[PDB]
Amino acid sequence: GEELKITFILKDGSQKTYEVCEGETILDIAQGHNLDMEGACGGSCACSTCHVIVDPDYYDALPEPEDDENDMLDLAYGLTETSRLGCQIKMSKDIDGIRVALPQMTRNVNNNDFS
Ligand code: FES
């Protein structure tokens, strides 16, 4: 088929560069691949860890969320000019070489496990 990819900047600063399909979501790849990362949305009724930021190349085409939706971003440290929403934007033909950064996360309160 046409093929696509996603780069994530790790909470460890590393780059990881993953082959995915169209219509896949960014927190959904991050925890679906179990990147070396912090977050909890992959658990059963656990979805409140929406926090990513984009490359200014692949943002420049992207929409802005509601005040309850963009709050799920703010929960991670150091929110930026190109912050993006982990269950509200996905891979399409225009993404072919996209990046995001995976920010450090304040509090998720799972004690032992989310999955
Ligand atoms: S990925 Fe869970 S709040 Fe968006």
From Swiss-Prot:
Domain of life: Eukaryota
Cofactors (names): [2Fe-2S] cluster
Keywords in alphabetical order: 2Fe-2S, Electron transport, Iron, Iron-sulfur, Metal-binding, Mitochondrion, Transit peptide, Transport
Entry GO CC: iron-sulfur cluster assembly complex; mitochondrial matrix; mitochondrion
Binding site for [2Fe-2S] cluster: C41, C47, C50, C87
Primary location recorded for the protein, binned into one broad class: mitochondrion
Entry's Gene Ontology molecular function annotations: 2 iron, 2 sulfur cluster binding; electron transfer activity; iron-sulfur cluster binding; metal ion binding; oxidoreductase activity, acting on NAD(P)H, heme protein as acceptor
Cofactor binding mode and count: Binds 1 [2Fe-2S] cluster.
Ranges of residues in domain 2Fe-2S ferredoxin-type: 4-106
Locations listed in the record: Mitochondrion matrix
One GO process term, biological-process aspect: heme A biosynthetic process
Function as written in the Swiss-Prot or TrEMBL entry: Iron-sulfur protein that transfers electrons in a wide variety of metabolic reactions. Involved in heme A biosynthesis and in iron-sulfur cluster assembly. Transfers electrons from adrenodoxin reductase ARH1 to heme A synthase COX15, a heme protein that catalyzes the conversion of heme O to heme A. Required for the de novo synthesis of Fe-S clusters on iron sulfur cluster assembly protein ISU1. Interact in its reduced state with ISU1 to productively deliver electrons for Fe-S cluster synthesis. Essential for coenzyme Q biosynthesis.
Self-association state and partner proteins as the record states: Interacts in its reduced state with the apo form of ISU1.
Similarity-based family: Belongs to the adrenodoxin/putidaredoxin family.
Note: Present with 14800 molecules/cell in log phase SD medium.
Name under which the protein is recorded: Adrenodoxin homolog, mitochondrial
Protein source organism: Saccharomyces cerevisiae (strain ATCC 204508 / S288c) (Baker's yeast)
Name of the gene encoding the protein in the UniProt record: YAH1
Residues of the whole record sequence present: 58 to 172 of 172
